[PDB]
């Protein structure tokens, strides 16, 4: 395979110590170094099963080794590494209560937000106590699909199966529930560097950029970006300037700050949507300009590589092409969800009925 | 719970930018000089430079250009900071009062955007129709210069060209027009656009895009009567103007890249050019007449004028005099003569101005008197490289030129000498290896000893070298502390870079050794796979190799630890014992780091600073003979230096010019929670800190209990700034913070920048107000304002004088406090 990297590494660091070379060149060199050491994540560290399929994933923001996960049957799990304290569990109905959105609480880490097929955007503890419901369908067969949160703004946002989005405060205060789309809202997210423009994606083959404080007039939006197929995810950058989008058939798109309408590059990659599989969500890496996605081969997709395996692919953002591929037998499932740690030293993967941890090996000999 | 005080001990000396113009009056020729946060204004005279005014700004100066709007009698000044504070300033003088007036100010930040690789570029059209800023890739920000635009409101124009290298406004255009060089997969090209303010858009430029040299890198806008643009590359110089196209490829310039330019003649007939080796050329434009009275370019020639300091910037003054502003070496005033000297140079130096930056390493030693600390820094780069010795009595500076790049310094009292790691550049010879471009310390020693090490000469696949590759040669120099003569130079192995240096004793062995950590550097390797720790003994005027340890990585850092050797090697931290057989033997290893670049120690505890995982606190457990992970800072920070303030307080500096302080979580109720360091201090310093070291240059008041500050750690920067960090009690912190807020209400900020904004922690991930840090510069600025302003500052201020109850402060109370504070540095 490819993975060639080269450079005059330490020199640049000293160049940075002299002021000659600019910081983005440093960021590029250490991005390459990060890829080189990610070539040693090949040894899969840990595996974890449980009951009904995995649907949503989330990282403990402050802690590297802690992670939370939510199932197809409303079964939530909280798991920490190097603890061995037999991780924490909570069950649900198990049939039609699929948790589908899951973000940690920025305030109380022993709390968590959740969006469920039951029709209940809730705030609940890992010990089982429901602290507070935020919204409700009040009529079954109409449920939520999307959820996200912001701490700098102290806001909650959630999306439906019909095309209307809801926006609440941390203490209630609902001033929202206007309709935005014609179909289900697959993903949604707020800017981390801003507080008052939003992004939402839907089955309508359109992804919309809103201004949550200015617009109130039922599709008096700010921007609307089209696509050729429906969209499973539209995720913001940490920096805030790059919006990543991933469709259902075969595509990834990078939109910029600079003219949201036009895209900067198209990254073709197979992640074909499917009914009983968990929907695929590309994701950023929090401290570089990389992209990470899970692959799902299609015999009809125009493959550039002659070898098409199920594996975790890692591309470069501002170029378009690939830079690394992680693969491990005994894990021949399809990695629906993949998310790097906010810390930057660990990767979590959610496959059907399985959760995988990929971190570096070392510790050749103890003393 | 950690409260610290940071103050400037020596302001930055490197010059980042310089411009000339008519700022103080229409008849005066002024020189304005930017030294990061400082702006100096001089009047240019026949003999040299007269200082007229020096001001500080609350920002890193990134752009500085003079301009004169219609109806104005003298130049205005545009300044942009690194945090994107823009301002237009005008000089106003009456009597002995000098004021910097703010004509306009505003923040030009976008809500989102990635700063560009070649950084912020800012240019102003010669007819003052608009200011243009290249801040972010893919965007061109335009500030229309309307009389009403005192807030510097701007609009963005899309740039199809996403990777702009340089851009200028052209002269002689009926509509504002930019010309810029850009890169795409097809190569590099030069293109123009007209800028329509009316349409708030680009229009097609007056002349078509042209292909340029693959390494075309700079654009010069030529004044009337020529108009057009000059494109400077590494091997060629081209001129474009409409249907006119002229290129030259003089081989002489190919040896070194031209990196700066400045117009000599108002009509563009002559330019100065400076390269990375300090060579200075003249570029001359010979005119050709035309029947219609226009003037065109007939030919281009380059002439070598001589040698200067490696120039960041040049400004021609008058009468053959040039100011050479340097960041890597001394600045200069030079004279250009019409006739050359015996060696063929037309340049004669008139005056040299000290620049201490970059400070790559430093130590404090009592060179002359007990209790009288002096700072010894590694300063400079390539032929400008030097050591600098700084002692009080404002400051006395001795300069020791080395003519090559210093990297590390240590003091070895038992040998009465310093050890200094250095590197020099060599280029390929006619038939053999490589040859140096000039003499330097490592080639002028009384004696020298090549590294004949055969530690891994056997069973080590040698890597080829392509004919044409230049090489860096690294050396350990031993330099006498009294005469500063180069007593010895030890050359390291081929492709071996020396990174770290310490002088210490180890184990039970009474000898003192020089210990060096290295990396084997090969061009195709993403990270080093080979390195050495080498233990040398200096005796009988030479270094004898006592011991070596081969490791599979770069030895970034080493520190003496209780008679043992602590070393960081790529992603590992390792503790070695010094055996009876004078060998290094591994005692223990810690692995849970990405890259451990910086170490400091106190007692049996070890603070590890990582490149990207910023800091971790380990304790060596002497009763277990291994390491224990105590706690980590789980917030990411890209480190440049670290320091231990005390057993409970850890100081860090990062690449985005911020400082932070970490403490153990006092309110932690679990081992897991105890393992989380809390970032309790944050401060935007605005400098890139390479090194902290414990010590002080102020005379020690032996038995000076009851002072406002405790401890003294100095730090050195790229710009040649030296700062001091010391510790404060809570009550002093609260008093000084109140003083800061009151000062911030009274002090006129150049460009009307708020101090809180300036000092706010800022990276591309997060922006937060400063905490836990007092701005000593701000406190000291109390002393230069008038007495009535002082009285305003302390009105209705509660102050505890000595030991007692709080009462109202008078100006004299705080004068005394601040005066006492000035003596800590």
Swiss-Prot record, chain A:
Consequence of changing residue 184 to E: In XP-E; impairs DNA-binding of the UV-DDB complex
Induction remark: Expression is induced in response to treatment with IR or UV and this requires p53/TP53 activity.
One annotated Gene Ontology cellular component of this protein: chromatin
Superkingdom classification of source: Eukaryota
SUPFAM superfamilies given in the database record: WD40 repeat-like (SSF50978)
Impact noted for substituting residue 213 to H: In XP-E; impairs interaction with DDB1 and CUL4A
Pathway the protein takes part in: Protein modification; protein ubiquitination
UniProt KW keywords: Acetylation, Chromosome, Disease variant, DNA damage, DNA repair, DNA-binding, Nucleus, Phosphoprotein, Repeat, Ubl conjugation, Ubl conjugation pathway, WD repeat, Xeroderma pigmentosum
WD repeats: from-to residues: 56-91, 99-134, 143-178, 184-227, 230-269, 283-326, 336-360
Subcellular location(s) per record: Nucleus; Chromosome
Tissue: Ubiquitously expressed; with highest levels in corneal endothelium and lowest levels in brain. Isoform D1 is highly expressed in brain and heart. Isoform D2, isoform D3 and isoform D4 are weakly expressed.
Domain notes from UniProt: The DWD box is required for interaction with DDB1.
Pathological condition linked to this protein in its record: Xeroderma pigmentosum complementation group E: An autosomal recessive pigmentary skin disorder characterized by solar hypersensitivity of the skin, high predisposition for developing cancers on areas exposed to sunlight and, in some cases, neurological abnormalities. The skin develops marked freckling and other pigmentation abnormalities. XP-E patients show a mild phenotype with minimal or no neurologic features.
Job of this protein: Protein, which is both involved in DNA repair and protein ubiquitination, as part of the UV-DDB complex and DCX (DDB1-CUL4-X-box) complexes, respectively. Core component of the UV-DDB complex (UV-damaged DNA-binding protein complex), a complex that recognizes UV-induced DNA damage and recruit proteins of the nucleotide excision repair pathway (the NER pathway) to initiate DNA repair. The UV-DDB complex preferentially binds to cyclobutane pyrimidine dimers (CPD), 6-4 photoproducts (6-4 PP), apurinic sites and short mismatches.
Protein name (record): DNA damage-binding protein 2
Gene responsible for this protein: DDB2
Curated annotation (Swiss-Prot), chain B:
Residue(s) carrying N-acetylserine: 2
Entry annotated with the keyword Zinc-finger: no
Entry's localization field: Cytoplasm; Nucleus
GO terms classed as biological process: apoptotic process; biological process involved in interaction with symbiont; cellular response to UV; DNA damage response; DNA repair; ectopic germ cell programmed cell death; epigenetic programming in the zygotic pronuclei; negative regulation of apoptotic process
Post-translational modification comment from the UniProt entry: Phosphorylated by ABL1. Ubiquitinated by CUL4A. Subsequently degraded by ubiquitin-dependent proteolysis.
GO molecular function: cullin family protein binding; damaged DNA binding; DNA binding; protein-containing complex binding; protein-macromolecule adaptor activity; ubiquitin ligase complex scaffold activity; WD40-repeat domain binding
Pfam family, one: CPSF_A
Region called Interaction with CDT1 and CUL4A, residue ranges: 456-825
Cross-link position per record: Glycyl lysine isopeptide (Lys-Gly) (interchain with G-Cter in SUMO2): 806
Gene3D superfamilies, per the entry: 1.10.150.910, YVTN repeat-like/Quinoprotein amine dehydrogenase
Pathway: Protein modification; protein ubiquitination
Alphabetical UniProt keywords: Acetylation, Biological rhythms, Cytoplasm, Disease variant, DNA damage, DNA repair, DNA-binding, Host-virus interaction, Intellectual disability, Isopeptide bond, Nucleus, Phosphoprotein, Repeat, Ubl conjugation, Ubl conjugation pathway
N6-acetyllysine modifications at: 752
UniProt KW Amino-acid biosynthesis keyword: no
Modified residues (Phosphothreonine): 810
Region feature (WD repeat beta-propeller C): 394-728
GO cellular component, one term: nucleolus
Residue ranges of the region described as WD repeat beta-propeller A: 13-356
UniProt similarity note: Belongs to the DDB1 family.
Subunit structure: Component of the UV-DDB complex which includes DDB1 and DDB2; the heterodimer dimerizes to give rise to a heterotetramer when bound to damaged DNA. The UV-DDB complex interacts with monoubiquitinated histone H2A and binds to XPC via the DDB2 subunit. Component of numerous DCX (DDB1-CUL4-X-box) E3 ubiquitin-protein ligase complexes which consist of a core of DDB1, CUL4A or CUL4B and RBX1. DDB1 may recruit specific substrate targeting subunits to the DCX complex. (Microbial infection) Interacts with Simian virus 5 protein V.
Functional summary from the UniProt entry: Protein, which is both involved in DNA repair and protein ubiquitination, as part of the UV-DDB complex and DCX (DDB1-CUL4-X-box) complexes, respectively. Core component of the UV-DDB complex (UV-damaged DNA-binding protein complex), a complex that recognizes UV-induced DNA damage and recruit proteins of the nucleotide excision repair pathway (the NER pathway) to initiate DNA repair. The UV-DDB complex preferentially binds to cyclobutane pyrimidine dimers (CPD), 6-4 photoproducts (6-4 PP), apurinic sites and short mismatches.
Associated disorder: White-Kernohan syndrome: An autosomal dominant disorder characterized by global developmental delay, variably impaired intellectual development, hypotonia, and characteristic facial features. Some patients may have genitourinary and skeletal abnormalities.
Record note on domains: The core of the protein consists of three WD40 beta-propeller domains.
Name this polypeptide is given: DNA damage-binding protein 1
Gene that this polypeptide is encoded by: DDB1
């Amino acid at each position: 395979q490819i993975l060639p990297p080269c450079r005059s590494i330490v020199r640049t660091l000293h160049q940075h110590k002299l002021g000659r070379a600019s910081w983005p060149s440093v960021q590029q060199g250490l991005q390459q170094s990060f890829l080189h050491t990610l070539d040693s994540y090949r040894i899969l560290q840990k595996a974890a099963p449980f009951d009904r399929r995995a649907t949503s994933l989330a990282w403990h923001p402050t802690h590297p080794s802690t992670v939370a996960v939510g199932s197809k049957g409303g079964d939530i799990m909280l798991w920490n590494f190097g603890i061995k304290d037999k991780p924490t569990f909570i069950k649900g109905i198990g049939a039609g209560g699929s948790i589908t959105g899951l973000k940690f609480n920025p305030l109380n880490t022993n709390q968590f937000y959740a969006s469920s097929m039951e029709g209940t955007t809730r705030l609940q503890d890992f010990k089982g106590n429901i602290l507070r419901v935020f919204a409700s369908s009040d009529t079954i067969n109409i449920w939520f699909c999307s959820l996200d949160v912001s701490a700098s703004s102290r806001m909650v946002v959630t999306g439906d199966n019909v095309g209307n989005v809801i926006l609440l405060n941390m203490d209630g205060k609902e001033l929202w529930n206007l309709r935005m789309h014609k179909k289900k809202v697959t993903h949604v997210a707020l800017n981390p560097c801003c507080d008052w423009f939003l992004a939402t994606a839907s089955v309508d083959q359109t992804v919309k950029i809103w201004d949550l404080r200015q617009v109130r007039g039922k599709a008096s939006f700010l921007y609307s970006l089209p696509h050729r197929h429906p969209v499973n995810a539209a995720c913001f950058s940490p920096d805030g300037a790059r919006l990543l989008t991933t469709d259902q058939k075969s595509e990834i798109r990078v939109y910029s700050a600079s003219q949201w309408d036009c895209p900067l590059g198209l990254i073709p990659h197979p992640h074909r949507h499917f009914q009983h599989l968990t929907p695929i969500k590309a994701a950023w890496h929090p401290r570089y300009n990389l992209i990470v996605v899970g692959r799902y081969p299609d015999p009809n997709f125009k493959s550039c590589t002659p070898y098409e395996l199920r594996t975790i692919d890692v591309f470069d953002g501002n170029s378009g092409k690939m830079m690394c591929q992680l693969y491990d037998p005994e894990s021949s499932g399809i990695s629906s969800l993949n998310e790097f740690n906010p810390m930057g030293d660990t990767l979590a993967s959610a496959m059907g009925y399985h959760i995988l941890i990929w971190s570096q090996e070392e510790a050749r000999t103890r003393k | 719970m950690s409260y610290n005080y940071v103050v400037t001990a020596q302001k930055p000396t490197a010059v980042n930018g310089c411009v000339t113009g008519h700022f103080t009056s229409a008849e005066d020729l002024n020189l304005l000089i930017a030294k990061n946060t400082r702006l100096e204004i001089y009047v240019v005279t026949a003999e040299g430079l007269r200082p007229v005014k020096e001001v500080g700004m609350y920002g890193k100066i990134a752009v500085m250009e003079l301009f004169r709007p219609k109806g104005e009698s003298k130049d205005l000044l545009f300044i942009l900071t690194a945090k994107y504070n823009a301002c237009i300033l005008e000089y106003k003088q009456s009597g002995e009062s000098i004021d910097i007036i703010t004509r306009a100010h505003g923040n030009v930040q976008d809500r989102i955007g990635r700063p560009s690789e070649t950084g912020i570029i800012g240019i102003i059209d010669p007819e003052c129709r608009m200011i243009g800023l290249r801040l972010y890739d893919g965007l061109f920000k335009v500030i229309p210069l309307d009389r009403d635009n005192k807030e510097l409101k701007a609009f963005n124009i899309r740039l199809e060209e996403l990777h702009v290298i340089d851009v200028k406004f052209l002269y002689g255009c009926q509509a504002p027009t930019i010309c810029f060089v850009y890169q795409d997969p097809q190569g590099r090209h030069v293109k123009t656009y007209e800028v329509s303010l009316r349409e708030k858009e680009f229009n097609k430029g007056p002349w078509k895009q042209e292909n340029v040299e693959a390494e075309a890198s700079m654009v010069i806008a030529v004044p009337e009567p020529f108009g057009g643009a000059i494109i400077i590359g590494q091997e060629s110089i081209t001129y474009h103007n409409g249907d006119k196209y002229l290129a030259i490829a003089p081989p002489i310039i190919k040896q070194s890249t031209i990196v700066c330019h400045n117009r000599v003649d108002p009509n563009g007939s002559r330019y100065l050019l400076g390269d990375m080796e300090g060579r200075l050329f003249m570029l001359l434009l010979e005119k050709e007449e035309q029947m219609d009275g226009t003037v065109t370019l007939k030919d281009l020639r380059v002439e070598l004028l001589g040698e200067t300091s490696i120039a960041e910037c040049l400004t021609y003054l008058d009468n053959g005099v040039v100011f050479v502003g340097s960041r890597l070496g001394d600045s200069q005033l030079v004279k250009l003569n019409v006739d050359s000297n015996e060696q063929g140079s037309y340049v004669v130096a008139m005056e040299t101005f000290t620049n201490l930056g970059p400070i790559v390493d430093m130590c404090v030693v009592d060179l002359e008197r007990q209790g009288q600390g002096q700072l010894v820094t590694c300063s400079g780069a390539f032929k400008e490289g030097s050591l600098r010795i700084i002692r009080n009595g404002k400051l006395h500076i001795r300069t020791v030129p080395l003519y090559e790049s210093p990297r590390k310094i240590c003091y070895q009292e038992v040998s009465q000498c310093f050890g200094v790691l250095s590197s020099r550049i060599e280029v390929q010879d006619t038939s053999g290896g490589t040859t140096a471009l000039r003499p330097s310390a490592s080639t002028q020693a009384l004696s020298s000893s090549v590294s004949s090490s055969k530690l891994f000469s056997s069973s080590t696949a040698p890597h080829e070298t392509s004919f044409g590759e230049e090489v860096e040669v690294h050396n350990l120099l031993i330099i006498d502390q009294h005469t500063f003569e180069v007593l010895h130079a030890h050359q390291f192995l081929q492709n071996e870079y020396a990174l770290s240096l310490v002088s210490c004793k180890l184990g039970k062995d009474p000898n003192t050794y020089f210990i060096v950590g290295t990396a084997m550097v090969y061009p195709e390797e993403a990270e080093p796979k080979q390195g050495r720790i080498v233990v040398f003994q200096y005796s009988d005027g030479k270094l004898q190799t006592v011991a070596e340890k081969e490791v599979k990585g770069a030895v970034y850092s080493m520190v003496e630890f209780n008679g043992k050797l602590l070393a960081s090697i790529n992603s590992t931290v390792r503790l070695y014992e010094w055996t009876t057989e004078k060998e290094l033997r591994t005692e223990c290893n810690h692995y849970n780091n990405i890259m451990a670049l910086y170490l400091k120690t106190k007692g049996d505890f070890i603070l590890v600073g990582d490149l990207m995982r910023s800091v971790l606190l380990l304790a060596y457990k002497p009763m277990e003979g291994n390491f224990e992970e105590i706690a980590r800072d789980f917030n990411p920070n890209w480190m440049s230096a670290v320091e231990i303030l005390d057993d409970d307080n850890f100081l860090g500096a990062e690449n985005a010019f911020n400082l932070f302080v970490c403490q153990k979580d006092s309110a932690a109720t679990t081992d897991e929670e105890r393992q989380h360091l809390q970032e309790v201090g944050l401060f935007h310093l605005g400098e890139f800190v390479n090194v902290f070291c414990h010590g002080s240059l102020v005379m020690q008041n032996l038995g000076e209990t009851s002072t406002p500050t405790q401890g003294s750690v100095l730090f050195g920067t790229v710009n040649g700034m030296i700062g001091l960090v010391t510790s404060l009690s809570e009550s002093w912190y609260n008093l000084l913070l109140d003083m800061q807020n009151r000062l911030n209400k009274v002090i006129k900020s150049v460009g009307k920048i708020e101090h809180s904004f300036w000092r706010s922690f800022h990276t591309e991930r997060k922006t937060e107000p400063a905490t836990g840090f007092i701005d000593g510069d701000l406190i000291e600025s109390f002393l230069d304002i008038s007495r009535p302003k002082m009285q305003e500052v302390v009105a209705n201020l509660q102050y505890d004088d000595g030991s007692g109850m709080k009462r109202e402060a008078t100006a004299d109370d705080l004068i005394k406090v601040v005066e006492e504070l000035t003596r800590i540095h």
